[PDB]
Every structure is written in C-alpha cells, then in structure tokens.
Write a protein that binds this ligand. Structure first.
Ligand SMILES: O=C(O)CN(CCN(CC(=O)O)CC(=O)O)CC(=O)O
Ligand SMILES: [Fe+3]
Length: 498
C-alpha cells in the first residue's frame, strides 16, 4: 500500500486534547488541530484559519478575519464562535498555561461576527502571533466535543480541522491516523499513518531493520546513534540529519553548594571536552554548543565568549576559589568540604547515562566528584520543578520558542531554569527584564534587553551548554525525501510525497 505508512513513537499519542499537555504528544495534536496563523521557517507567520488581521495603534486589540469555508472533520463549521469558545476553554485553565505569557496577556476574546474574531491583550505583546502558531494550546476542537462546556476536564472525540483524523488508539500498542478527505487545504499524498508504540531506541532500530516500520523521525534519542551512522551508509535505507534545532545543556544550581559559587560554575564550563563527548556518546552526529542559544537563534548573536575545554584553566579557577587537593586525594576540598556535585538524569535513558558518565570523568580530572543520580522520569521532573539538583540535563525548545518563550518561562518558579537561577543576586532584574522584553515595542530596547539577559546568564555560568542537536530520519527509500517542520516539535507528515 504505497500511500500507507507505519512509523513508531515511544508512547501513544494521548487523547488528543488540544488544550492539555502530557500525555498528549505535540506532533499529533498538530496533525489534527490547527492554528489561526501558521509559523514559517523565516520567523514570520502566514494566514491559516485566519485569512487576515489588524490591530489597534496601541497594539492591544487584534481583529482576525477568518476563513469561511472550514469545517471540522465531523462536518460542523469552524467560525469565530467556535474559535472564541476554544480560547475560553484554554483560559479557563489559565494556571496551567503560566509558562506561556500569551495565556496571561489575553484579557478578552469575542466573536464579532461569524468571520470576525477579536482578541484583547493586557499589553502590546510582541510574540503574539508566533504563540498563536504553537502546537498547543491555542488550536481548535469542535465545541461540541467539549465536556460540560469545558476542555480542561477532558474532551469527547478529538475533532479538529486538520489534515489528519485519529482513527483509533490502543494504549501501549498503536495509534492510526487517516487523511481528512474533507480538509479545507491541500490533501496529503499519504492516506494512512500507523504509529507503533515502541519505547526502547534499540527496539525501534530493530523494527526498522525487520521491515515492521517504514519511518523513524525524532531527535537525538530516536535510535542508537551508532546504528544511525551505520544505516546512513546502508544502500537499502535512507537517512537524514537536519540542521540543529535546539540546545542540550546542563543547568547548574546557583542556589546549592558548591554550584552556588561562580568560580565553580566557570570551572565546570572549562572541564568538559564537548567535541569528545559528541564523538564518543553522540557518534559525531551533533554540534558542540558554547552558549545557551546557538548564534543563529533570533536575538542571540551576541559575541558571547566561549569557555573552550581547558582543564588547566578549570583547575586554576578552582584553586583560586580555595578548592584544593588534600594530600593523596583526587577530589578537592574547601573548609574540609569535598567538591561533590550531584548530576541528575533519567536513569533508563541510555544516551543521558552515557553523557553523564563522560561528564563525570572529565570533571574528576579537575578534582570535582560528580555523583550520578539516575532516576525515573517523574522523579527527575520533580527535581527540576523544586530545584532539588546540583546539575541536571535540560534542553531548549526550538523554533518558535527560542528565545522568547524559553526566556519567558525562566520567570516561572516551577521550572528548572528559575530554580537553577534562583541563587543569582540579579535574578529579580533578569525576571524584570524578561517581562519588559516581551512587551516592548522599541526594537532597540528589545535587542538590548535580550543582550542583557543572555549575557548575564552566560557570564554567571548558569548553564553548561553541551550540544546543538538535530532531527534525524530513517526511512524506506520509496518514501522519498522526508521534510522538516518549521516548528521543532512538529512532524510534517502531510508534506511526505513518495
Ligand atoms: O511540557 C509542558 O508541560 C509545557 N512545556 C512548555 C514548553 N513546551 C511546549 C509545550 O509543552 O507545549 C516545549 C516542549 O515541550 O518542547 C514545559 C517544558 O516542556 O519544559
Ligand atoms: Fe513542554
């Protein structure tokens, strides 16, 4: 069947509530649900469910003109009432969306007619349109499928306007999607997509080698990277590696001994041989990261000075800070206290473990004792939210989140970044400036504020950037060239064209 494919995902796609997070998978929410405006790789948006829009001079009131020809997959019309009901349903759960500042800025949403939708904002929020473009939460389910006139407590059928329809889901086995034959836009070439639930990366590679699946698409965790490199040379297969999409880093706890000392954080940022780490654990497949955001990220080409691998310098910094080696020991001490740092990661994630072992080795060579704390996912996320870590693996979010949304979220205390930053004298100023940068319409001031925030974060050595990672593809050749989505968390199945 040349227009049916089988792929894999580590978990089910979830219930496909458009307005909720885990266990809903973003790429799948994006398959069914659509936005008012669609994000493009150049950073702009184009008309989508909204054909056009205007705003007020003060930038607080926006009026969208909607398409008039869009139906939900169940035949019900998409109109301004439906869109307004969705916004209400999202904002009824406002607390859950704190990380996204548009959810705090929207003050009112109302359908002025079937085709006119008015959105009012607290302030002149510059990332407005890009945040409407996101996979979640501002996309649209048929209001008939609300439960008790809400979505925050669940939905009935996951009815969107999008090019794919969920056919069926079987927990821990598979999810099947079919093409929407009444889609308002271009019809996908592919008719059916089956997602086999395959949690282990090795098991995913095996499934591809046996012919059980036709396509694997995902980030650096998709399959073992040595196997990837092998497949890349195998003439029976097709593989791809995108340009980098986001940063993988450690976050260092500025509020916990001994990472509360700037000098210790500086030393750590000279201690890791990142090129080696990438060649060893990532099989040469990713790029070295010197800064939180790659220089290609909007607002982030700042000429920030890299801390290159330099164990001599790391040891000098620590000696100067009073962290010195006792007679016959390899671990430094200050005030009888050992230089001991806990590194938390997801313990069943083989790649993270491999990286953690490398980081531990490199840091031992400069007299820091890194203890590896590998735990289940829920325990790691809990550590991130409450700052119970020394160092922790973390990542940025990709386009169109990076940098404005990721920075916005640094203000939210129940996220790793806030927690890592909590010990900085200038954290309140950073948070103030993050608030300002998002509202400011003076473009000169906006660049200054991004420079200031990112520069403080860099100079304070809050992070240990490791790698700018890429999306990876393995496919049967008959599927052809597999496109990448502008939005880093989306999978553009509708663009596959054998
Ligand atoms: O996952 C969440 O609950 C919310 N996200 C907000 C950022 N997300 C977008 C999302 O979940 O909608 C980025 C991402 O998950 O890549 C927090 C996080 O991932 O750290
Ligand atoms: Fe998220």
């Amino acid at each position: 069947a040349p227009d049916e494919i089988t792929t894999a995902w580590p978990v089910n796609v979830g219930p496909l509530n458009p307005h909720l997070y885990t266990p809903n998978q973003m790429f799948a929410q994006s398959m069914v649900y659509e936005p008012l405006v669609k994000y493009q790789a150049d950073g702009s948006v184009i008309p989508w469910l909204a054909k056009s829009w205007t705003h007020s001079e003060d930038g607080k009131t926006w009026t969208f003109t909607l398409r008039d020809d869009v139906k939900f997959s169940n035949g019900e019309p998409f109109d301004a009432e439906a869109a307004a009901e969705n916004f209400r349903a999202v904002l009824d759960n406002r607390q859950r969306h704190a990380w996204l500042e548009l959810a705090n800025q929207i003050v009112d949403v109302k359908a002025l007619s079937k085709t006119e939708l008015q959105i009012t904002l607290k302030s002149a929020y510059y990332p407005f349109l890009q945040e409407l473009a996101l996979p979640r939460p501002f996309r649209f389910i048929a209001p008939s499928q609300f439960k008790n006139h809400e979505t925050m407590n669940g939905i009935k059928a996951p009815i969107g306007t999008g090019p794919w329809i969920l056919q069926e889901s079987k927990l821990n086995q598979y999810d099947v999607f079919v093409r929407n034959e009444n889609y308002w836009g271009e019809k996908p070439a592919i008719k059916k997509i089956t997602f086999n639930v395959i949690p282990d990366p090795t098991t995913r590679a095996v499934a591809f080698e046996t012919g059980d699946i036709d396509l694997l698409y995902g980030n650096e965790g998709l399959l073992p990277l040595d196997t990837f490199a092998r497949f890349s040379q195998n003439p029976a297969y097709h593989t791809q590696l995108s340009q980098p999409i986001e940063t993988v880093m450690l976050a260092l706890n500025t509020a916990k001994a001994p990472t509360n000392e700037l000098a210790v954080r500086e030393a750590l940022n000279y201690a890791v041989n990142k090129k080696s780490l990438i060649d060893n654990a990532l099989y040469g497949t990713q790029q070295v990261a010197d800064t939180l955001f790659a220089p290609s990220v909007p607002y982030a080409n700042l000429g920030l000075k890299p801390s290159q691998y330099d164990p001599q310098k790391a040891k000098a910094l620590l000696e100067k800070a009073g962290w010195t080696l006792p007679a016959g020991k390899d671990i430094r001490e200050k005030n009888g206290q050992p230089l001991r740092i806990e590194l938390s990661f997801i313990g069943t994630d083989a790649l993270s473990k491999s990286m953690a072992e490398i980081i531990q080795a490199d840091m031992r060579q400069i007299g820091a004792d890194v203890s590896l704390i590998g735990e289940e996912e829920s325990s790691i996320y809990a550590r991130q939210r409450d700052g119970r870590f020394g160092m922790i693996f973390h990542r940025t979010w990709g386009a169109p989140y990076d940098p404005h949304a990721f920075l916005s979220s640094m203000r939210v205390p129940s996220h790793a970044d806030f927690q890592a930053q909590q010990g900085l004298a200038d954290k309140p100023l950073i948070d103030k400036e993050i608030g300002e940068v998002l509202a400011t319409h003076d473009e000169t001031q906006r660049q200054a504020l991004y420079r200031d925030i990112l520069t403080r974060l860099h100079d304070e050595a809050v992070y240990l950037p490791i790698s700018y990672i890429s999306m990876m593809v393995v496919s049967k050749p008959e599927l052809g060239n597999i496109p990448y989505a502008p939005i880093a968390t989306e999978i553009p199945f509708e663009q596959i064209k054998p």
